[PDB]
Each structure stands twice: as C-alpha cells, then as structure tokens.
Design brief:
heterotrimer; A mainly alpha (30); B mainly alpha (512); C mainly alpha (23); A: 30 residues; mainly alpha; rod-shaped; B: 512 residues; Leucine-rich Repeat Variant; 0% strand
Chain lengths: 30, 512, 23
C-alpha cells in the first residue's frame, strides 16, 4: 500500500509594510 | 513667505463664518477660495492650524448638494492630508466618517479625493484604522471593486489590505460583501502590475482566515493566482506564492490545475529560496491524496525537480519537510507510482534521503522521510541501494527510541506514528533475503514480538507483518517461537482488523 | 426673500475683498 498522505497547515499572514503608490495617487487626482 | 502666512491667518476666521453660512451661494464661493488657498504652502499651514476652519470644511463636505462644493472641500482635505499636522486636524474634526460617506459619491473626482485622503490617513495617522472600520468603510470599499479605473482600484485594494491585516472582523466583513470573488476577478482581468500586487496582498491576508480561505478557492483564486507565477515582478510572484501556500490545504478537490502544477515544478529550480520553499509546500498539499494531480506532477519531471531541491536544501527543514512529503505522495497509489519510485533512485535521491533520517533532522522531517523510504521499498531495485546507505540500522535505532518513549507529542509528532512508520518500512524491506539477515542480526525479533501486545491496531498489523516476512526462513522462525510469539499471535487471530488476523495466521503456519 | 438678498450681496462682496488681499 504505502505510507499515509498528509496535509501541512500553512497559516502565514506575512508582514505589513507604498512609495510606488504615491505616484499613482497624485496621477489619479490631476 | 512669512507675509503669506500673516495674510492667510487674518483671512481665515472670516472665511470660516462664510463657509458655515445658510446661503449656499455664499458657501460655494467660500469653498472655492478655501481650495485655492490650500494649494499654496504658506496658507495651507494656516488652514490646518485652525480647528474651526477644518471642521467647517468637513461639515460642508458631508452636507452639500452642490458638485463644485463637494469637489473643492474634498480637494482641500486632500491637500491637508500630505502633512502630519493636517492629518491630525482631519482626524480630530470627524473627517474620517465624512470621507467614508463620500465613497458613495457619483462624482468621480470626489471619489478619487476621498480614497487617496483615506489612504494617507491609514498609512500615517494613529487611530485611523478603527475609525474607518467603525464608519462602515469596508463594505463601501468592497463595493467599489467593480469600478474599472485601475489606479483607483490599486488604492482601494491597498486600503483593504491595511485594514484587514491582523483584524478578524474586517476579514469577515470583506467576505460578507463579496470580497473574494471581486478580488479574484481583478487578478483574472487586469495587467497593471501595481494593481495585481496590492490585490494579491489582500488575498494573502484573507488566505489565513478559515472562512475566507474556502471562499477564495471556490471563486477560482488558485487558478487565477497561478496566471502570474512567471510575471517579471518578483513582489507579485512571492505574494501569489505565499497566498497559494495558505490556500493549498483546502484546494485538493479542485480541477483545471494543470498549468499551476507545471509552473510550480519549474519554480523548484529558482535560485530564490522563498520561491523554492513555497513551491515545495504548495506541491506537497496539492498532491496529498489527489491521484490526478500526482499524475500531472510526475509527467512534467516533478520527481527530478523535487530530488534536486532536497539536494540543494541541505539541513533546511523548511524546504526538505515539504519536498520529502511531496515525494512520499508521488510514490504511492497512482498509475505512475512504480515509475516514481524508480525515478527517485535514477536522479540521485537515495543517498540523500537516507542521510535525512540522521541528525540534526527533527521529528517532523524524520516521520516523513521514513514514509518516503517505506514507499521506495515497494520497488525491488531500491532494496539493495537502501541497505548500502544504512537505512536499516537507522530505522531500527529510531524504532527502539520511539518505543522506549511510549513506556517511559514530542516536537509536534506522536511517538506511536514513528513506531508504526519505521516498523512499516522494515516490513517492506524484509522482502529481500539480504535485508532479512541485517534486520535479524540487529536483535529486532524480541521487540517485534513485544509489539504484538500493542493496543493500537495499526502497530499490531505492521509488527505481525514484518514477523511474517522474517519467518519464511527457517532459523528465524525458530527464534520467533523461542521468544514466546505463539500466544499473542493466537489472541490476534480473533481480531476485528482483517490484516492483523491474516498475518497472524501466516506466522503460525510457517512455524511448522 | 428681500432680507436674505442683502445678506448675499454683502457676503459675496466680503469674498471679493478677501480675494484681493490673498491674490
């Protein structure tokens, strides 16, 4: 038969961290 | 510059009374002028230092039915929002609830001012997140995801990401407002890299929530994220991969995954360690008990790619645990499992896998490596090389360690699974006559007989099974009798487990 | 109304006066 298959539970939200957007924002309003 | 500030300061009190006047013709003209003032650096410093003026601007924006007056006040607040002191004035004047109302405006210029100002507040102003949430801003931002201006969408999705991070309440609101389908649709539709990046970051944050995760999978987010795995932007690729990994354990009933699996296998050869890591973890979950995905992964050279990843990884268990788990999966229970078992050998995988059984490997990686070896042992051509690499003495040594623990959760793993796993692997290796001489010469027969008294049924079956294989040779059959194996095997004949009773009968027959 | 019409003419005049000082 073989070994049992198994799920690994990944639950990583990463980090929070913007300047590419400063250009987007001012371009959108002019 | 200093005379500009004096002039503005004196004008402001009178401008404030006119701006909060009954006559809307008066208010319109006053608001147009207040906006012109807010463009110049000197006079806008005067504006943000007057709490009453900023309040008048906020009140007028909430209340006005004139379009020019909506545009000017919103533009005024937006100019103030580029400075720390202007942000604080907007917050202190009840400007967040007002701006949230303006997210329902049919005037696009007001809409664009309102979201960009709110984006500034969310980045730089303590308290701005709870206020936006409190004001019902999330429901509104999600509704705006069906607009088509890509720049406006990029800022909207970034506001969603800031607000959803580490906040369960905001994740559920987003889900209750149709957030997943709208985000996944954006990924399926646009090519603007700024927007794809911010949207992928929201999906990453929602993918750790257990209500949102199934909803993203149902909408086709797995397949949509896969579409961008070869984009030139690395921050996009890494976000898509982090997200796919969170979603992977709830995506095993999903179809049309051929393209995604193919790309994940190619990504195993990246020189970026975070890319290899996510590719391995995603593949391990998507092959888990899914014969269709296993066939596709083997067909695009997945075994070679996975063996090469284990060789590069070294003692990095973040990479080897999932890579070994994927190899375990690909070497059992599908059409091409025999080919895969041979393929681990032919691509230089046997020495490296047996080495992973040894320290400094930890119990999660040892549990999975034992499992991979067990599968590999189903193929006769691996019997000999596995003996040569020292698999047998090390499996036996881990079995003694895990069994002794069970008399007198360690590292996340139950010690009974290691007893079942290692004995299970020895059960299948014992199909080789040469392996039977090694196994027996390590004084294992005493311990295998003592395992017949194990309460867990799966251990009885596996201990009886290896005893059954060892008994086919005569001198070994006598040592099993001499160890007092006849009694417990007789009581195992009357077992509800069909395999336990079968092997138990087969041992008893070969002792005569 | 008549009273409110005077209020407007004066108020709009105040605005033009301020706009000269600033611009």
């Amino acid at each position: 038969l073989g070994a049992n298959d198994e799920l690994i539970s990944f639950k990583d939200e990463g980090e929070q961290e913007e300047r590419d957007l400063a250009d987007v924002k001012s371009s959108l309003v002019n | 510059e200093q005379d500009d500030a004096e002039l503005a300061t004196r004008a402001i009190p009178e401008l404030t009374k006119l701006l909060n006047d009954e006559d809307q013709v008066v208010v319109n003209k006053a608001a147009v002028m207040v906006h012109q003032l807010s463009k110049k650096e000197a006079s806008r410093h005067a504006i943000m230092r007057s709490p009453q003026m900023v309040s008048a601007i906020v009140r007028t924006m909430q209340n006005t039915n004139d379009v020019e007056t909506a545009r000017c006040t919103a533009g005024t607040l937006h100019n103030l929002s580029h400075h720390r002191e202007g942000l604080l004035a907007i917050f202190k004047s009840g400007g967040i609830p007002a701006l949230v109302k303006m997210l329902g405006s049919p005037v696009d210029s007001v809409l664009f001012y309102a979201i960009t100002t709110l984006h500034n507040l969310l980045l730089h102003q303590e308290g701005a997140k709870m206020a936006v949430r409190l004001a019902g801003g999330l429901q509104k931002m999600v509704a705006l995801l069906n607009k088509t201006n890509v720049k406006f969408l990029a800022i909207t999705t970034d506001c969603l990401q800031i607000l959803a991070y580490g906040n369960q309440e905001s994740k559920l609101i987003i889900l209750a407002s149709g957030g997943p389908q709208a985000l996944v649709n954006i990924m399926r539709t646009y090519t603007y890299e700024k927007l794809l990046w911010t949207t992928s970051r929201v999906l990453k944050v929602l993918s750790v929530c257990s209500s949102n995760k199934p909803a993203i999978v149902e909408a086709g987010g797995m397949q949509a994220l896969g579409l961008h795995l070869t984009d030139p932007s690395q921050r996009l690729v890494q976000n898509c991969l982090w997200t796919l990994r969170n979603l992977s354990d709830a995506a095993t009933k999903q179809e049309g995954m051929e393209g995604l699996l193919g790309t994940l296998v190619q990504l195993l050869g990246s020189d970026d360690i975070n890319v290899v890591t996510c590719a391995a973890g995603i593949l391990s979950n998507l092959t888990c008990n899914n014969y269709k995905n296993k066939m596709m992964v083997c067909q695009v050279g997945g075994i070679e790619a996975l063996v090469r990843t284990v060789l590069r990884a070294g003692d990095r268990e973040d990479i080897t645990e999932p890579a070994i788990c994927a190899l375990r999966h690909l070497t059992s229970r599908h059409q091409e499992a025999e080919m895969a078992q041979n393929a681990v050998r032919l691509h230089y995988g046997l020495p490296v896998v047996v080495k992973l059984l040894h320290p400094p490997s930890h119990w999660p990686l040892i549990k999975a490596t034992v499992g991979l070896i067990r599968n590999l042992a189903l193929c006769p051509a691996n019997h000999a090389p596995l003996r040569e690499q020292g698999a047998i003495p090390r499996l036996v040594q881990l079995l003694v360690r895990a069994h002794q623990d069970t008399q007198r959760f360690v590292e996340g793993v139950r010690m009974e699974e290691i007893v079942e796993g290692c004995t299970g692997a020895l059960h299948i290796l014992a199909r080789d006559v040469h392996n039977r001489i090694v196994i027996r010469g390590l004084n294992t027969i005493p311990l295998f007989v003592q395992l017949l008294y194990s309460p867990i049924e799966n251990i009885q079956r596996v201990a009886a099974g290896v005893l059954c294989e060892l008994a086919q040779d005569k001198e070994a059959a006598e040592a099993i009798e001499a160890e007092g194996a006849t009694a417990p095997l007789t009581e195992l004949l009357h077992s509800r487990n069909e395999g336990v009773a079968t092997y138990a009968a087969a041992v008893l027959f070969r002792m005569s | 109304s008549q009273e409110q019409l005077e209020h407007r003419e004066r108020s709009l005049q105040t605005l033009r006066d301020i706009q000269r000082m600033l611009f």
